[PDB]
Design a protein around this ligand. Structure first.
Ligand SMILES: *P(=O)(OC(C)C)OC(C)C
Length: 249
């Protein structure tokens, strides 16, 4: 969050707060707007989960590089906490039903549809007011449970055009979600770009088939590989590469 507090020559920031409908989760949303002028068709915009951790890792070198191409509006959707994650809240908000199948691991799970309604009908309309946004260039990113949320949203949403799903293979219901992803009807998901991002290191077998089937179904689906990265470097790589990609790299 602190780069928002400090300011950047490349971008200006504001922060807004929202509550879940059940009243028990409390969101802190940072909007970073480029200080360079938007193209006439508007800024691309990337909505990013785990927003507190994204803001802690955002730095001027990335903002400078984004500004070499078409810098996006960045919406970091975080929590009212002084830690980089709200582990309880994200396990609820980011996960679909399937994540708790045949287990007693479940911090409760299964809040993805209510969090998507909050995001698409409450947070996004508010933070886009007053900005020239290129709606065809609206993207969503998340890692780990956040990567499951992105797959869940690629299946159900009409709001975003680009979906960057990082490390979803870490989730228990990864295969169940891939099974739904490759079951979609031909052509209906053609306007929803899907970018699967994996590092960590099979998983790759699953992804190549996934890409093959989705292509056959008319989907622009791609794989970003960050070989042998640990969790921290992969969190960083995938969010920064998603920003760079949506800026036009
Ligand atoms: P992710 O939300 O985070 C890893 C970096 C530990 O993990 C879930 C899938 C267990």
């Amino acid at each position: 969050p602190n780069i928002a507090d400090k300011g950047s020559v490349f971008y200006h920031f504001s922060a807004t707060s929202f509550d879940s409908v059940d009243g028990t989760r409390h969101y802190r949303v940072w909007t970073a707007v480029p200080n360079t002028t938007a193209p006439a068709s508007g800024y691309p915009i990337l909505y990013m989960l785990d927003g507190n951790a994204v803001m802690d890792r955002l730095d001027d070198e990335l903002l400078k590089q984004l500004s070499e191409k078409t810098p996006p509006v960045i919406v970091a959707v975080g929590y009212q906490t002084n830690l980089p994650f709200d582990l309880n809240s994200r396990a609820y908000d980011y996960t679909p039903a399937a994540e708790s199948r045949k287990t007693d691991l479940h911090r409760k799970s299964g809040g993805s549809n209510n969090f998507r309604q909050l995001l698409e009908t409450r947070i996004a309309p508010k933070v886009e007011q007053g900005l020239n946004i290129d709606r065809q260039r609206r993207g969503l990113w998340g890692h780990s449970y956040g990567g499951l949320f992105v797959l869940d949203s690629w299946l159900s949403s009409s709001y975003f055009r680009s979906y960057y799903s990082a490390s979803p293979s870490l989730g228990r219901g990864y295969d169940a979600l891939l099974s739904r992803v490759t079951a979609v009807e031909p052509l209906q998901f053609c306007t929803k770009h899907l970018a699967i991002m994996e590092g960590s290191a099979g998983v790759l077998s699953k992804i190549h088939t996934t890409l093959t089937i989705l292509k056959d179904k008319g989907v622009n689906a791609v794989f970003w590989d960050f070989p042998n990265l640990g969790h921290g470097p992969m969190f960083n790589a995938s969010f920064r590469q998603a920003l760079l990609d949506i800026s036009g790299e």
